[PDB]
Design a protein around this nucleic acid. Structure first.
Ligand code: NA
Ligand code: NA
Ligand SMILES: [Zn+2]
Ligand SMILES: [Zn+2]
Ligand SMILES: [Zn+2]
Ligand SMILES: [Zn+2]
Lengths: 162, 162
DNA sequence: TTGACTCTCTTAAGAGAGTCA
DNA sequence: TTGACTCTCTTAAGAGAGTCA
């Protein structure tokens, strides 16, 4: 098994490569009517992506390193968290984009949490709008708001009470 | 089936049958430290479920009726909305449980909205904790809270900024 | 050892349709 | 006609593993 020192070297090589990705400045809602700025380090749209990186799906990538003749591979956003517990409360940990920008690999825009926690950030009011996430959101979730409900609760007769 | 009259008859027979499901009281968080009471009309756990109903999955059911010698079948929670547009902004409309209780078929606990709007209610703070859903939530979402994030954003080197 | 592709899978909110009696 | 089962699919947040040169 890879030693903790070998893992740190993988994280360091990953950071060095991602750090050279194009850095894109995005203006984002923070909640409470305030605007902020996030700086995303975006993997390219097509090959080559960077040393060690390859695309396994339309918005999925993996990082690969060969150590002592053994090929090791990880989901491309999971590498910052290789020295962390990989589950919590019986749930698998997932890389969660605080910036909601899938191509971004900035580790300052990622956290490591259950898929439910991950998904829920899509609807968070944001760090200036009432976010209660203990690891705070960086921005208001892209799906926050009144929604677009087509039809509400209703009955034709009188069979039901709320 | 095709005619508005036929559709209304389908909705009316569905309401009559669901109206005879056991009524189960559930006390629920509303947000803001307040509690409310919902009355769910719960489909039985095992057959027989009711005239027209059959289970197609662990928590999936379908309603079916024979109209002009032809069988018509719908997802069991979609029947209240048969007269509504089946899509919004190019997204499929889905039956959305305001009570977060899949067995419940109370149409006063259902709305008709995109799957994204549907999912997002799981994390809503609730009608007394800041819900902004235009069709208001009946309760705080079951997944609302600080989360259980294992690791937050971090970097080892000095290549990234927020 | 490396790049650039290929494939299928997980989850939890939701769906459609066929086989029998 | 009605009931009670069976199967796979959709979405958008996420994954692991194989092939070839
Ligand atoms: Na996410
Ligand atoms: Na729902
Ligand atoms: Zn980012
Ligand atoms: Zn948040
Ligand atoms: Zn209910
Ligand atoms: Zn709400």
């Amino acid at each position: 098994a890879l030693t903790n020192a070998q893992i740190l070297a993988v994280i360091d090589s990953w950071e060095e490569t991602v750090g050279q990705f194009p850095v894109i400045t995005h203006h984002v809602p923070l909640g409470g009517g305030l605007q902020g700025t996030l700086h995303c380090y975006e993997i390219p749209l097509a090959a080559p992506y960077g040393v060690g990186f390859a695309k396994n799906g339309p918005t999925r990538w993996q990082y690969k390193r060969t150590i002592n003749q053994v090929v090791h591979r990880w989901g491309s956003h999971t590498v910052p968290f290789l020295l962390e517990p990989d589950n919590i409360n019986g749930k698998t940990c997932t890389a969660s984009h605080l910036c909601h920008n899938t191509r971004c690999h900035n580790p300052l825009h990622l956290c490591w949490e259950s898929l439910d926690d991950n998904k829920g950030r899509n609807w968070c009011p944001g760090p200036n709008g009432g976010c209660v996430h203990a690891v705070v959101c960086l921005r208001q979730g892209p799906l926050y708001g009144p929604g677009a409900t087509v039809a509400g609760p209703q009955q034709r007769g009188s069979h039901f009470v709320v």
